[PDB]
Write a protein that binds this ligand. Structure first.
Ligand SMILES: CCCCCCCCCO[C@@H]1O[C@H](CO)[C@@H](O)[C@H](O)[C@H]1O
Lengths: 213, 215, 212
């Protein structure tokens, strides 16, 4: 019973590694110029903020018996950090440079603030509930982009901006982590990951629809 | 007792008043029905509304919150009506983009709702369940208020009450008042707060209607 | 006894005095409005949002909601009064009937709504859950206000000009945020510390930006 839970966690984590390779396309495009035209820099920053707070949830002081999420969000957050660090010097125009760096300062300092406030002001079991609520809120907030790109596919009647390799992996990742939180009976892990399972399932199905015809 | 009877009277009153609100888009859907076009109309609000009605309906049901059944009844009959609407629309939709958009959002709302209901009964044992489904529900209902506030804005800017009918505004004012009374009697915050907030909005709406209708 | 109290009251008073500059900040606009007698160039909503914030926080400050929260009621009270004065001047000096009606309607919504949530807070909730509720609502408000100065920082970074964003205002705001942060810190009240800690961060970033 335990073994299956742990295996599920490892599987979900390793699956997340695949989703993390998705933004490499714009990063290929940076050598010429890094804006990117038609695209906006902040989401990567946003994603890292999320991964930070979730990593906070993962740590043993906040919630006991919840080790693996700290692992996936940790390696994920670090890899994101690499992205923003790469962006800011290669940023186009000083204005963009300063904006992204500033927002980064905001994220790091703020996360330090909520980490500190969380560990100081809150005693168990409240601490877990709070950091949990914030984590679930972040994960749910993130889902906006896949829903939007789904909208774009419907509008264009074409998968012109939606890759399958990324999508299938994310579907598997949500299913796995949903199983993780469900088996662990921790709601904060289960719910958003289940919602992600739904959004991904819709993604795969609609992809079948527009790839077919 | 007098409290049981009053509670039922308030709940039912809210139900009957609300019925007008649910039947309000029947004119637009009749016009949609004519010439079988959804080109001119959208279309999405029925999804946002169905999601809301389901989550409040879940709250009403006896497993999550007991003795608040009339809420389940209004939200249920309401959800069926909205579902009929999105179905009529979804087949009568003009262009594949609109039809498939509505289909997708429908799958999204229904599966999502299933997820939150199931999680609610699974992960949560009483009374926290009631508190959770309550907060989610209250959040939804308060979120709905965006549209009438918006049309109040349109009325003020256009100095016209074209998009604000008194019959509807008054009826919804009454349902809000009634359910506000309902929660108030039940001493249920989750019922009282959003409908009370709605009572304020309906009151302002009726007032602005008075101000701008007179001339 | 411990050095809890001595720092505790002084932090609140000092923070309040530092805070005073922010409430007087838009008076320049009203000076420019008073000569103008228009309000065309300016809208209009921010004074209402700010009044809403100030009432929710003031309610939190009251002994009805929270015991031992004395200074907060004071600063938020002075704030609410000033904001109400602003809204009255804007609404009377309003440019166009549309603006006048927009503002009057929203003022009605805010005052009526706040009274509503006050009543519900004191009615439905018994301690300590009440303080937790009014705290959560207050915190959401205060954090919500923070969007606008961040917006002016965005405008400054994007537009090379450091127009708007006063150093006096920025320093005063950093100081008030920091002080009330210490107040929440000593009280071990999360709802007080967290938004003000965030304010200390935003003030720090702004201070950094004056060093263009
Ligand atoms: C969006 C969330 C905002 C705060 C929501 C929390 C409201 C607190 C619930 O109030 C009352 O507390 C009782 C316990 O004392 C409950 O058993 C009862 O059902 C309820 O009437």
């Amino acid at each position: 019973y335990d073994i299956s839970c742990f295996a599920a966690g490892l599987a979900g984590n390793i699956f997340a590694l695949a989703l993390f390779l998705s933004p490499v396309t714009t990063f290929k495009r940076i050598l010429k110029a890094k804006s990117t035209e038609r695209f906006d820099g902040l989401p990567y920053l946003f994603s890292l903020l999320n991964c930070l707070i979730c990593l906070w949830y993962g740590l043993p002081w906040v919630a006991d018996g919840r080790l693996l999420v700290a692992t996936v969000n940790g390696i994920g957050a670090v890899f994101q950090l690499a992205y923003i660090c790469l962006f800011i010097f290669y940023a186009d125009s000083r204005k963009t440079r300063m904006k992204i760096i500033g927002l980064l300062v905001l994220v790091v300092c703020g996360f330090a603030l909520v980490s500190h406030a969380s560990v100081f002001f809150f005693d168990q079991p409240l601490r877990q509930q709070f950091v949990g609520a914030v984590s679930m809120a972040s994960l749910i907030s993130m889902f906006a982009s896949p829903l939007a790109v789904m909208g774009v596919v419907i509008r264009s009647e074409s998968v012109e901006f939606m890759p399958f390799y990324l999508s299938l992996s994310t579907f598997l990742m949500s299913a796995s982590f949903a199983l993780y939180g469900l088996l662990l009976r921790d709601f904060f892990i289960y719910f958003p990951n289940g919602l992600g399972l739904i959004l991904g399932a819709m993604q795969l199905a609609l992809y079948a629809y527009y790839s077919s015809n």
